[PDB]
Amino acid sequence: STAPAKKYTRKMWSVQESEWLKQGVVRYGVGHWERIRSAFPFAGRTAVNLKDRWRTMVKLKMV
């Protein structure tokens, strides 16, 4: 299955990156923003992008 959604404003983001992020943090354990970041083909995103999407998802208990 894929990750949930959330009404917001931003470029066309791929839910795939989320699937790997959620499971990645669950298996690799939070804190490994870098190790987990390797999940998707990063081009210009920093580790913050990982800890961010994770933090937000945590608040909405969606992850």
Side-chain angles (χ1 to χ4, degrees), residues 4 8 10 12 17 20 22 28 30 32 35 37-38 41 48 51 55 59-60 62-63:
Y8 267 123
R10 214 68 60 74
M12 49 142 279
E17 76 212 349
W20 314 132
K22 298 183 299 91
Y28 226 140
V30 72
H32 277 64
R35 259 298 99 197
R37 172 174 151 200
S38 288
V48 180
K51 78 189 194 149
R55 265 192 213 191
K59 181 154 204 71
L60 334 180
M62 274 195 199
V63 56

Side-chain angles (χ1 to χ4, degrees), residues 3-22:
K6 52 189 182 160
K7 47 173 158 180
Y8 267 123
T9 22
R10 214 68 60 74
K11 53 155 291 203
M12 49 142 279
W13 73 82
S14 279
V15 186
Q16 269 177 278
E17 76 212 349
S18 328
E19 284 148 63
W20 314 132
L21 228 187
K22 298 183 299 91

Side-chain angles (χ1 to χ4, degrees), residues 39-60:
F40 46 69
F42 50 82
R45 303 291 165 173
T46 184
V48 180
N49 189 234
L50 290 309
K51 78 189 194 149
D52 169 53
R53 186 155 217 80
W54 172 93
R55 265 192 213 191
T56 300
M57 289 269 187
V58 167
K59 181 154 204 71
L60 334 180

